[PDB]
């Protein structure tokens, strides 16, 4: 069935699973044409497929060329996502294929299920959580490779850097979603928070700064304050 706050620890067990998020697959800018009408112009996108236990991220870059000459692109995007997830699975050695895939939007269930008919033992599930994965394009190095891409391209990351050396995947996932929730609600403040102290750098092989244990606790508090704040600034409370 669905994934919600009650069966939350299943994400960290030893059953391989992947979240798929398709919110950034089809992206556009809206602009006015000379004649004064509105037109869309598409920009590169990506599929966010993440192992919540290992932190492995299979970032598939959706080059704008894949929309050329197509109609009903919002709907094709969901079918293109499923086609690419299925290809990823088929590329993995059996003992590495996921036992469940969790789609962050219900509109992806039917497209993925159809593409995965060859994998009847892989459970396609929805979730009742409001996970902030759409803010993944606020992470500079992920944004950078998508926008630079000139062809379809898969790029592999560990979204937890080296955290797992020192904390559990449960804690690691909680930090990530707090960071992504903060970036989603007020990106400038979230980014200011992360980068104030110039002495804390981001390693070339990492996505986030090399905070100590103590520095992460302060950081995490600042992101909570931000998220509580913007909620007031928004509802007036």
């Amino acid at each position: 069935g669905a994934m919600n706050s009650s069966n939350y620890a299943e994400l960290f067990n030893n059953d391989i699973k992947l979240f798929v998020d398709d919110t950034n697959v089809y992206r556009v800018t809206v602009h006015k044409t000379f004649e004064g009408n509105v037109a869309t112009k598409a920009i590169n996108g990506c599929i966010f497929t993440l192992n919540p236990k290992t932190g492995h991220l299979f970032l598939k870059i959706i080059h704008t060329s894949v929309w050329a000459g197509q109609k009903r692109l919002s709907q094709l995007a969901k079918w293109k996502t499923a086609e690419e997830v299925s290809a990823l699975v088929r590329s993995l050695p059996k003992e590495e294929q996921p036992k469940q895939i969790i789609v962050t939007r219900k509109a992806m269930l039917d497209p993925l299920e159809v593409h995965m008919l060859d994998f009847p033992n892989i459970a396609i599930r929805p979730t009742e959580l409001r996970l902030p994965f759409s803010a993944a394009m606020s992470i500079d190095k992920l944004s950078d490779v998508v926008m630079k891409a000139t062809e379809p391209q898969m790029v592999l990351f560990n979204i937890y850097d080296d955290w797992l050396d020192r904390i559990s995947s449960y804690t690691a996932f909680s930090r990530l979603t707090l960071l992504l929730r903060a970036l989603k609600t007020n990106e400038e403040s979230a980014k200011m928070i992360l980068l104030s102290d110039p002495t804390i750098t981001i390693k070339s092989y990492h996505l986030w700064p090399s905070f100590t244990d103590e520095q992460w606790i302060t950081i995490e508090s600042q992101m909570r304050d931000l998220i509580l704040t913007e909620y007031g600034r928004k509802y007036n409370v």
């Binding site: 079918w79 499923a82 086609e83 039917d110 497209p111 159809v114 593409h115 060859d118």
Partner: protein, 300 residues
Amino acid sequence: MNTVPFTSAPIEVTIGIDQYSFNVKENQPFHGIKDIPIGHVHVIHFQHADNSSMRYGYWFDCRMGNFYIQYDPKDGLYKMMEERDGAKFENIVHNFKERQMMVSYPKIDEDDTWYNLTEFVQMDKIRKIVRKDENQFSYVDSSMTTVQENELSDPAHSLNYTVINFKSREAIRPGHEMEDFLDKSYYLNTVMLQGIFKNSSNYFGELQFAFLNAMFFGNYGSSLQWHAMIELICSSATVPKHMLDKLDEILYYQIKTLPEQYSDILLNERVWNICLYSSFQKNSLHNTEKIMENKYPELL
């Protein structure tokens, strides 16, 4: 004109013959149904006055033998049987007519309802769906499950309808995932029509039989099948013009004949709103849509 005589009516029962039904009292002198129109399949069906649970009944064709009804007090139901001694059978039937103990299947000079409900239903096909080959008539009841239902338990007493599954490899060609799932023409036209049914008439015949089982016995899985066969057509962008026209006719009479009070269990809101208002064929069922909107606007 043919006859289905009854040995007797020892228990109180509502009897139905095609779309008509009457009441027979415990041990009333009743000996059967006469003036039955040759040339169509028929259904005689039973609901006991004591136990409205279990509607049951027999599909049959009077051309395929001399059939009679006899109550069995061990099994506790009206059983259909065949008399091979045709002389004995004509003799018996003539005596009950002379004594006028048989009700008359209504001869109705203007009504084609039953023909329109059974146009493509044929007894030979029924007996592939309801396997019991030692008899020429076919038993059905409220509770019998379909073969696709037993996949999701007794195979002998099942309704072996054609399995339809929109999320199946059968239905979806590799490489055409999105195309074959949004436009099911491939599945209708090549898999089902060319592959399994061979022609539109076998297709419609199964659709009609499924609807009647649902309507007369409330057989849930027949209702599921009826609605599935409808949905596949309605979700195919390419359908022979002549299938669409006959489908509109078929459904129209199905909708017209449905008991008004039963429309809430036998009509699937989603399938019909999809078929009449969203699907490729939304513009193609003019009689069906007019009757549906004038009789059950609530469901839409």
